[PDB]
Amino acid sequence: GSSGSSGTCVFEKENDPTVLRSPSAGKLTQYTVEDGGHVEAGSSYAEMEVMKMIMTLNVQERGRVKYIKRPGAVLEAGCVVARLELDDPSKVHPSGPSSG
């Protein structure tokens, strides 16, 4: 049992902390959150189909998931799917460090 496959191994330094690229090829289907939907770091915001398998897509860092690419596109390794919008990029609360 072995069909066969091959590809190139190229590296590219370009991945913003507010971007949700595809870790592996597949096929975009739909999302599990509404426009600019807010979720937790780890929650699923969308899914995909790869190797005849449906895999869930989680956010690398809590924020707001938004659909950019139309639903039903070709998911490829190291590609763009949706961007994340940090809802808490900075917010110094009125309280410093205290004995522990």
Swiss-Prot record:
The modification N6-biotinyllysine is found at residue 52. Mitochondrial enzyme that catalyzes the carboxylation of acetyl-CoA to malonyl-CoA and plays a central role in fatty acid metabolism. Catalyzes a 2 steps reaction starting with the ATP-dependent carboxylation of the biotin carried by the biotin carboxyl carrier (BCC) domain followed by the transfer of the carboxyl group from carboxylated biotin to acetyl-CoA. Through the production of malonyl-CoA that allosterically inhibits carnitine palmitoyltransferase 1 at the mitochondria, negatively regulates fatty acid oxidation. The biotin cofactor is covalently attached to the central biotinyl-binding domain and is required for the catalytic activity. Required for the maintenance of skeletal muscle lipid and glucose homeostasis. Consists of an N-terminal biotin carboxylation/carboxylase (BC) domain that catalyzes the ATP-dependent transient carboxylation of the biotin covalently attached to the central biotinyl-binding/biotin carboxyl carrier (BCC) domain. The C-terminal carboxyl transferase (CT) domain catalyzes the transfer of the carboxyl group from carboxylated biotin to acetyl-CoA to produce malonyl-CoA. Inhibition of ACACB may prevent lipid-induced insulin resistance and type 2 diabetes, making the enzyme a potential pharmaceutical target for treatment of obesity and type 2 diabetes. Residues 11-85 form the Biotinyl-binding domain. It is found in: Mitochondrion. Widely expressed with highest levels in heart, skeletal muscle, liver, adipose tissue, mammary gland, adrenal gland and colon. Isoform 3 is expressed in skeletal muscle, adipose tissue and liver (at protein level). Isoform 3 is detected at high levels in adipose tissue with lower levels in heart, liver, skeletal muscle and testis. This is Acetyl-CoA carboxylase 2. Monomer, homodimer, and homotetramer. Forms filamentous polymers. Interacts with MID1IP1; interaction with MID1IP1 promotes oligomerization and increases its activity in a citrate-dependent manner.
